Design a protein around this ligand. Structure first.
Ligand SMILES: *[C@@H]1O[C@H](CO)[C@@H](O[C@@H]2O[C@H](CO)[C@@H](O[C@@H]3O[C@H](CO)[C@@H](O)[C@H](O)[C@@H]3O)[C@H](O)[C@H]2NC(C)=O)[C@H](O)[C@H]1NC(C)=O
Ligand SMILES: *[C@@H]1O[C@H](CO)[C@@H](O[C@@H]2O[C@H](CO)[C@@H](O)[C@H](O)[C@H]2NC(C)=O)[C@H](O)[C@H]1NC(C)=O
Ligand SMILES: *[C@@H]1O[C@H](CO)[C@@H](O[C@@H]2O[C@H](CO)[C@@H](O)[C@H](O)[C@H]2NC(C)=O)[C@H](O)[C@H]1NC(C)=O
Ligand SMILES: *[C@@H]1O[C@H](CO)[C@@H](O[C@@H]2O[C@H](CO)[C@@H](O)[C@H](O)[C@H]2NC(C)=O)[C@H](O)[C@H]1NC(C)=O
Ligand SMILES: *[C@@H]1O[C@H](CO)[C@@H](O[C@@H]2O[C@H](CO)[C@@H](O)[C@H](O)[C@H]2NC(C)=O)[C@H](O)[C@H]1NC(C)=O
Ligand SMILES: *[C@@H]1O[C@H](CO)[C@@H](O[C@@H]2O[C@H](CO)[C@@H](O)[C@H](O)[C@H]2NC(C)=O)[C@H](O)[C@H]1NC(C)=O
Ligand SMILES: *[C@@H]1O[C@H](CO)[C@@H](O[C@@H]2O[C@H](CO)[C@@H](O)[C@H](O)[C@H]2NC(C)=O)[C@H](O)[C@H]1NC(C)=O
Ligand SMILES: CC(=O)N[C@@H]1[C@@H](O)[C@H](O)[C@@H](CO)O[C@H]1O
Ligand SMILES: CC(=O)N[C@@H]1[C@@H](O)[C@H](O)[C@@H](CO)O[C@H]1O
Ligand SMILES: CC(=O)N[C@@H]1[C@@H](O)[C@H](O)[C@@H](CO)O[C@H]1O
Ligand SMILES: CC(=O)N[C@@H]1[C@@H](O)[C@H](O)[C@@H](CO)O[C@H]1O
Ligand SMILES: CC(=O)N[C@@H]1[C@@H](O)[C@H](O)[C@@H](CO)O[C@H]1O
Ligand SMILES: *[C@@H]1O[C@H](CO)[C@@H](O)[C@H](O)[C@H]1NC(C)=O
Ligand SMILES: *[C@@H]1O[C@H](CO)[C@@H](O)[C@H](O)[C@H]1NC(C)=O
Ligand SMILES: *[C@@H]1O[C@H](CO)[C@@H](O)[C@H](O)[C@H]1NC(C)=O
Lengths: 573, 573, 573
């Protein structure tokens, strides 16, 4: 009959907000190399809390998530911030004099290293300096008695050498939302990227996400749980990348067996340039090894789950990439500072039908890079002395279907990728951000006299006793610097708005503040047995969400003001 | 009689604060390249509300407004931000060797364009490049086989090319104040600039203001109603500009018949310099057209209002600009990218005794500009390819009077301008920012036991029923980015201070409350019928403004502390 | 028996927070623009409030004061900010060719002023310029038939010319604590800098302190009272400085008799380089003067007050500095823009046994400078034309004890300094920041039915009637603005946390409230009369902070939740 206002109901709606980084601050409390990304984040909770929701079935969507875009923008801005402070190599674009290096009489790499020598400025503007350095063939381009060259990007973009002190080591970060927002987590083991997730769990924020950069194979990412899953925006469409994820890792070992040496040239006053001085001992190519039997078994599995969608009689035949830029055409990870670019033509060999030492990947290195498909600004990665070795493990792939015929007697899958959002979407697949609103109104028989969300799936009557748990922690009282400020300002304003709305009414209280506005039959007149015993809060929100504004207006104006002026006139005499 | 505290009365008072931007969704969603000003402006509400205050009369002042200065600072800051991130053109200073253009036939514009050639640097620091470009006569100065010149600014300032993609296209901007403030709006049809406006209305924020930059003639402005209103700070003083506002607009057309060509010179790495390569076909001077009959009629209408201020039978005479810099001597503006500088001696030339064709304005174009009289921050607008044409309205003038004696036989009005504040002040003449304060105290016979401003003109008895409406909107739950954040924080702060000051008294959760403070007769006591039925809250607060601190001190000391301590002593048994 | 929560109670504890500047408007209104970026600082309070606290004893310490480090960081940041828009002199690193003092007659100083002639780029790229300048012997280092030199730091740092408009003139800076905090001012006459101060006071803003710079002598410092004070972290440790603060000042006059003239050389466009053109008249030595009798008397006082720690009849000896950099070896300072560097060996040249016109100190001047022992950043102070004279007051030394022994026979003292924290620490020795904690709990017999800090020393019974004054003040109503914004948001967040924590309990009504938690005897049981009337509020915080968290837990969980769970039954009707 009479309206009653409830504060702290289990209700949420989809929204987007400014997330802030959290990371393990104890590891870097003792200072180390100034990492590219992870600094100034709030310390992470030593005991993260994950709460399971009893009966809810939330709808997820991988390919229209906003956290991926926020992550990509954050990484781009962090990289741009990192590159700015240190040296600019504007005076290095000069005509070079380059000849082939003479290794320690070992062949098959003779044409790849140059010994460019050139003129460079010095401290005093009136004088010039004569220097030399070693450049890779992919870094230096010809300009048309030994022939003379220039750097590759002199006619496109400038160069800012990376600050030698920082380190491009990926290390995990946690994206945490402001107070008043919650991040759901799809939990079932067969989530194909879209559709309902019958198992859901609320977490304050995420686990450790390593911002690894790669094009053709995903490295160090999170594995699947039950089986190797295949995800795509629309599998039937050939234009959409077919992300894949493994359940057991395939180990890849990469090396640069050259005893490189750094050599600093001054281009001062103050500024210095680090050249590739000289290589000691033999010179050999950089190669990556992947176990043959393990890779064969992994592909023989992926083809098995891949035939679930494309029929169980078709012929599946992998192949190397079609072509394009060197980033797209070759697996382009980074290992300790050097930016490899490796072939992968030996991996994607097979032709499957219904019925042992290693695989070597010969490859090459480039020092100058302009990643994220950008133009107008490049970077010069300084050389790293000594042999460098990495042991990653392949966790997923990025496939693309040819779709070259309509009969569909066979299918051909060439690996691709290069849009860095695909790497992030492979990790943020089981998250979304929701906006908790704690206020609610429902009819009852009042007349006023003169887990964190574990009750979400329960009926409205069952959830009418746990109101306090929602409202207890509603406030929870340079990149990563302004984001925290905006996040906490938004949280404070949300708490203040909720308190003001609950205060202008007659309630000023937490649990079950009865009111006096009569229940109009126009606001979905149902039997109270059909309301309290049948429905739940999330369902109760939807049909009445049109009329919440009218009920708020009636409570604030029609009832409280008249009631209080009546009390004031009562105390007159 | 005892004091009673009301929260959310219609009281306001004049104040100055920080405003933020807001733009239309159409301009917000324009996929093309960003406009010079609006990038992070929040989208505007599709339906702003007008809450005409009914019986209120407020004192307006056009000249001493603070919105104008804030707009000027914001515009200058936006320009400086716009020019920072693209090409700097320091190495263009070279001794240029120039020669006249050959024209086509029947030479008429010989001395304006020069065919300058100079040696310019290329990407490779070793080599040099021979190029040529066409510079207008106003952009070069001779130095002492053919003659040689330098650029205009290479002994005062360093050039900086305007970014080639961004366009200085004026578009509407709305300046909206944060929560807890209001922007009143005068609507008197004959508002001359100062004095009380008997018809006052409040909007959430202003109408669309086009930030057009021009001098000597206001373009694309807002027109008056029923009269050709004329405004000035002081008509007797001859050192003050006399703004005008036409009833109906005057159509002005402008053209640049030369068919330019954009020649790209690469002076990298990365940078570039766009040059006026060569002109195709016939070559002629830029000119602007204004209808003769319309302009004659408009002058004949404006002189009638000048006769009112300066008396009947006085002869009003017009004359062209007094002389000085080219910025103020000629009607300067930009039409699609080219900065025109048009002679206006054909318009301001007439004499008016007591009792079909088109006018052609010769015009000249300049490329190197240092607008806003800020020497040291020059700019080089790149050439715009193809014929340029635009059609605009003239909706105002900026006249100045001649002060040679008075002996009022006649007056001589000469156009002026140059200070850009007058362009903004012509649009923001019907607004001012007033901060709303909700708290208030008034007497009555009660003692305690032991539209958004539509009621601003109503009596205190009727106004006390609308405390909810006033009290609701006190939170409303790059340069613009920090403006919005600071304004939001300020609003939250003011609301929290109001809440705390209400809470130290015994009236925390209530809009109205009775208190046991006696009403001292020294506070201008009056019969209740003369307060609650013969006064309004704005008029009441104007009377008790001296005793507010004493009453607040009494309420916080004599009542709450003593009451709580005595109640604590009572609860012991 | 029962617990009762008190809000707004005079209790504080040590804490650190970012402070904000406050300077008078006259400094900005001075014609010398941007002397210290006064626009950043807030206008000063016209009447700072000092409230005497009558019974409080507080533990002071200056050797761990955080305000010293905050002032140092603020000064460094302001200095770096000031020079950013100024000219950069990278093209000045040229092979100079210098030949002593050929243009003038000089006394026996001989080769201190080098007459340097060298090439330079004119306002145009094409043509070079032949110019000259006078550089001091300290500003040029030889490089290997007239000899040739270069500037001192052409292989270390890039000079940036000081802007000529601004001047490095110190002005008062007032430090004001943000909302919620307070600054305690110790007023004891004989305060050593450590231990309990029995005459504490409080101030909203500190007294005006001038950020002077000088190594071996403190200039314009604040004077002590009634005796020369000696302060040290541990006097018997040889490695720690021993500050001194004279009772009465010793005046020092300094002069630059050379009559310099400024020559403006153009490095255009938009850049100028001010050289030392020529010296009119005879070359003469720069020197400083100190009164002999006054200085001898001051050292006679310092020995009297410094033998107190060491011995009544121990030999104490003074001596000049040992060696090292010119900054530490010699008393440096600025005198009207010229950075003097004067040896003080004519002053510390005394020996004192167990039981006549003026001291003159000739000294040098250096132009290129980089204070704080910084590397990578430098400045070139332009010449100050005309004869220069200064007058200053010495107000404290910075001594240092030698580690040799002679365990008791003799003690040797030398001037020290070099780190600029000591100069700030000599002025902020009587101020520390404290954080106010307004919540408090005390036992009493109440059971619930089913100046700003002048009372900090008074008993709890009397201090319960002044809860309003503390509670009222807690809220207190581009680059470098985010610091103030973050401090402000932090204050708001702290207030909201306190209010929410009070709201979880059954005490939404502010100030003295009562709760039903019994008072366990284990929590420092005392008879009630000796709790309320034989003890103060600060001492109560020193005997509950162990159990305060558990008391808050009992209040928030054990009583209010059960009360609501009992109330829900009666809420149905
Ligand atoms: C006053 O407002 C008028 C709006 O009518 C301004 O004229 C407009 O100027 C723009 C920019 O030149 C014109 O758009 C351009 O059109 C050309 C094609 O001619 C196109 O190639 C460009 O990319 C751009 O879209 C626009 O057509 C023109 N308006 C009209 C009706 O022609 C005028 O510039 C304003 N006054 C001042 C002083 O800015
Ligand atoms: C997924 O992509 C496929 C493209 O193959 C879409 O299927 C096409 O739909 C159009 C429109 O009806 C037909 O003309 C084509 O013949 C279809 N192609 C095939 C191979 O069947 C499909 O609609 C897309 N799915 C979604 C949900 O967008
Ligand atoms: C990729 O696959 C092709 C065939 O699919 C491989 O070519 C085979 O090489 C072996 C070894 O000489 C021959 O015995 C076969 O006859 C070849 N097959 C065909 C169809 O000609 C090729 O070597 C593979 N390359 C890599 C790098 O894995
Ligand atoms: C200044 O004199 C005081 C004694 O009056 C010394 O301070 C004492 O220091 C000890 C050591 O920490 C403390 O336990 C005492 O409480 C302090 N008492 C007082 C009154 O401050 C201090 O050491 C002297 N300073 C110097 C530099 O010698
Ligand atoms: C102050 O400094 C002195 C000297 O540095 C310290 O005294 C020394 O203490 C060690 C440890 O017992 C002895 O081995 C030395 O012989 C002492 N030297 C002298 C000269 O006394 C003293 O401990 C320091 N005091 C404080 C409070 O730090
Ligand atoms: C610093 O200079 C001042 C003058 O500007 C000196 O003060 C003067 O000294 C002379 C000689 O003793 C007196 O005749 C004047 O009356 C003094 N003038 C004033 C205003 O006091 C001062 O002695 C100099 N100090 C030093 C250390 O040389
Ligand atoms: C400051 O003055 C003293 C005293 O004149 C200078 O000390 C000289 O030191 C050198 C090296 O031992 C010797 O010439 C003498 O011992 C001292 N000179 C005289 C005349 O006795 C000191 O060099 C001066 N400071 C500077 C930076 O030169
Ligand atoms: C297992 C291992 O050694 N990993 C490291 C890797 O973390 C680091 O980034 C780089 C250093 O060489 O490569 C290797
Ligand atoms: C148990 C219950 O809710 N019964 C109601 C009944 O009281 C009501 O008369 C009828 C029509 O509205 O709907 C049903
Ligand atoms: C001297 C001169 O300008 N001649 C031009 C000619 O080059 C051009 O082909 C013709 C058509 O536009 O117009 C005329
Ligand atoms: C020794 C002492 O302090 N006694 C006091 C006194 O008030 C009384 O004896 C009792 C309770 O009032 O305990 C307490
Ligand atoms: C607030 C409080 O009582 N803190 C106590 C302190 O008084 C005591 O000296 C110390 C050792 O027992 O333990 C802690
Ligand atoms: C505008 O009108 C007011 C009267 O309301 C008058 O005081 C003022 O001088 C007028 N100003 C002008 C410029 O006409
Ligand atoms: C007293 O109140 C009456 C209301 O009926 C009013 O008419 C009268 O003017 C008042 N007199 C004074 C002195 O305020
Ligand atoms: C400059 O003066 C110094 C000091 O007397 C002297 O050693 C030097 O030889 C002089 N320079 C020349 C060029 O004579």
């Amino acid at each position: 009959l009479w309206v009653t206002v409830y504060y702290g109901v289990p209700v949420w709606k989809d929204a987007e907000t400014t997330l802030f980084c959290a990371s393990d601050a104890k590891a870097y409390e003792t200072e180390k190399h100034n990492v590219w990304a992870t600094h100034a984040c709030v310390p992470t909770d030593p005991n993260p809390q994950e709460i399971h929701l009893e009966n809810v079935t939330e709808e997820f969507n991988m390919w229209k998530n906003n956290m991926v875009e926020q992550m990509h923008t954050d990484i781009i801005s962090l990289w741009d911030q990192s590159l700015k402070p240190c040296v600019k190599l504007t005076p290095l674009c000069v005509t070079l004099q380059c000849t082939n290096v003479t290794n320690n009489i070992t062949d098959d790499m003779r044409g790849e290293l140059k010994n460019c020598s050139f003129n460079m400025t010095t401290e005093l503007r009136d004088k010039k300096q004569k220097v030399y350095s070693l450049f890779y063939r992919l870094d230096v381009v010809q300009i048309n008695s030994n022939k003379e060259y220039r750097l590759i990007n002199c006619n496109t973009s400038a160069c800012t050498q990376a600050c030698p002190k920082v380190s491009f080591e990926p290390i995990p970060i946690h994206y945490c939302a402001p107070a008043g927002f919650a991040i759901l987590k799809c939990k079932d083991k067969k989530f194909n990227g879209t559709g309902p997730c019958p198992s859901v769990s609320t977490v304050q924020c995420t686990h450790g996400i390593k911002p690894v950069v790669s094009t053709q194979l995903l490295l160090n990412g999170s594995l699947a749980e039950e089986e190797v899953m295949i995800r795509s925006e629309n599998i039937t469409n050939n234009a959409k990348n077919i992300l894949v994820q493994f359940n057991t890792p395939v180990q890849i070992n990469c090396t640069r067996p050259n005893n490189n040496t750094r050599k600093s040239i001054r281009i001062g006053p103050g500024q210095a340039f680090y050249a590739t001085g000289d290589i000691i001992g033999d010179i050999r190519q950089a190669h990556c090894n992947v176990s043959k039997a393990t890779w064969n078994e992994t592909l023989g599995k992926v083809v098995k789950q891949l035939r679930k969608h494309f029929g169980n009689n078709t012929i599946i035949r992998f192949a190397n990439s079609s072509g394009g830029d060197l980033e797209v055409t070759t697996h382009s990870f980074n290992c300790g500072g050097e930016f490899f670019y490796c072939n992968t033509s030996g991996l994607f060999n097979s032709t499957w039908i219904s019925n042992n030492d290693s695989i070597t990947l010969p490859c090459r290195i480039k020092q100058i890079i302009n990643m994220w498909q950008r133009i107008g600004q490049c970077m010069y990665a300084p050389p790293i002395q000594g042999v460098i070795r990495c042991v990653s493990n392949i966790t997923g792939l990025i496939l693309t279907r040819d779709g070259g015929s309509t009969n569909s007697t066979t299918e051909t899958f060439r690996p691709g990728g290069g849009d860095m959002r695909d790497n992030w979407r492979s990790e943020l697949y089981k998250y979304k951000v929701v906006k908790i609103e704690p206020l609610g109104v429902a009819p009852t028989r009042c007349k006023r006299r003169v887990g964190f969300l574990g009750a979400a799936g329960s009926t409205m009557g069952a959830a009418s006793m746990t109101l306090t748990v929602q409202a207890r922690n509603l406030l929870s009282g340079t990149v990563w610097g302004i984001k925290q400020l905006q996040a906490r300002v938004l949280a404070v304003e949300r708490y203040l708005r909720d308190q003001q709305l609950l205060g202008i009414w007659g309630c000023s209280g937490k649990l079950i503040c009865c009111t006096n506005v009569p229940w109009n039959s126009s606001w979905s007149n149902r039997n109270l047995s059909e309301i309290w015993d049948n429905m739940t809060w999330l369902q109760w929100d939807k049909e009445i969400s049109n009329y919440t504004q009218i009920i708020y207006g009636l409570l604030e104006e029609s009832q409280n003001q008249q009631e209080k002026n009546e009390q004031d006139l009562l105390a007159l005499d």
